[PDB]
From a paper:
Comparison of the first crystal structure of NMT2 with that of NMT1 reveals a highly conserved active site, consistent with similar kinetic parameters in simple recombinant enzyme assays. Previous studies suggest that NMT1 and NMT2 possess both distinct and overlapping biological roles. We therefore hypothesize that any potential differences in substrate selectivity are driven by NMT–ribosome interactions, subcellular localization and other factors that can only be recapitulated in native, intact human cells.
Author numbering: 109 to 496
Write the structure that this text describes.
Amino acid sequence: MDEAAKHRYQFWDTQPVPKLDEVITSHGAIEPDKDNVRQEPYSLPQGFMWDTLDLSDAEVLKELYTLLNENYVEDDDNMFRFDYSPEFLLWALRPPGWLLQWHCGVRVSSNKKLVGFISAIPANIRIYDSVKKMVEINFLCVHKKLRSKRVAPVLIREITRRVNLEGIFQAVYTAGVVLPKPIATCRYWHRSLNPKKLVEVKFSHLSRNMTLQRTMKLYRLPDVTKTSGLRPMEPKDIKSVRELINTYLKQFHLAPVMDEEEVAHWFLPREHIIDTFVVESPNGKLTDFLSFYTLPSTVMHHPAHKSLKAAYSFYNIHTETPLLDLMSDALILAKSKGFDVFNALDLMENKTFLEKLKFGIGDGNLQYYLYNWRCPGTDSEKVGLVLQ
Ligand SMILES: CCCCCCCCCCCCCC(=O)CSCCNC(=O)CCNC(=O)[C@H](O)C(C)(C)COP(=O)(O)OP(=O)(O)OC[C@H]1O[C@@H](n2cnc3c(N)ncnc32)[C@H](O)[C@@H]1OP(=O)(O)O
Ligand SMILES: [Mg+2]
């Protein structure tokens, strides 16, 4: 509530990362690669065990789903919780280069109840002039009952171990809370697509005084998209999408570098997981693409609705079409698919449209972090990486 004090990074102090608020003017690995690496798993509190989850096993996925449905990311006010679908999880956790030893679970020794999880997946990552093989870390989760018993540092050490085994010594990760040390701090913005449901669910916030009718009328969108050539992406586009994305991403201080197998993984439309629309220039050649992913949230304690449907801006590449025109079509497309809210961070060039497409700013930050790499902290606008 009010209770301002000062934190000691019991776990994070010990780790290869910069001290919170050291001034960094250098570029490089905080420590060199471990040429000899620990081969035995870290010790768990008694009653608990390591499991490598096989998500191909329908019952295991279902357990993982239920763990996260019930114990994953919640907002400040705790009226909302991420409801990552089982298939969304299959998409996010099994890109090209994925290894199963990187799907790390914690289970109750006796009744086998899944109570912990952390995941890693491979990616080539460009920090300023250095493109490094890293992993992206996601889905850290400890069961509500098990909170505050130092289990999160066990999973983090353990995943640090199984990744190090494989010759990776750098990683990237985001979190909504401050740790040592943010490269950058982004802010979520939200765009009402359906302001009535947003109001009844209490997600917004009618700006007193404002009628409902006037709100609905402000966020009014057309029913049909504007850009000539605009259509879903199909397999034949894979090659041109790659080229377009690796070129566009050059301008940003942080960005992945993707091959084609990765391009097909991340961008080919999958219903209720990922949408990608390409702009085909008047002949046949591709000049732009917008994309966005599907992530509903559980509305906790409410009578009317139990789920809020959100679109997350992913990567939007513009060469011919202006960006604000692309994003206007992204909004229209999301609206017409029954989403209630379009969400975007203020990274890349997104600041160039947020205010103009009537996004409003939202609570809390998203910090971006690197593991075992020092570099100065750049602005949101210079961040060209997006994680699920
Ligand atoms: C080269 C490969 C490298 C691989 C790994 C690289 C790094 C990967 C790092 C992972 C990146 C994940 C990316 C990602 O998944 C995206 S951010 C999503 C994180 N998950 C959630 O918010 C789920 C809801 N919360 C929880 O489940 C728990 O509260 C968690 C699991 C967060 C901690 O459960 P707990 O019961 O509340 O905590 P204790 O067991 O008592 O442990 C407390 C220690 O945990 C530190 N902590 C708290 N939140 C953290 C966070 N979000 N990152 C890192 N550390 C975090 C905390 O500062 C303290 O350390 P300190 O004493 O030093 O201050
Ligand atoms: Mg704990």
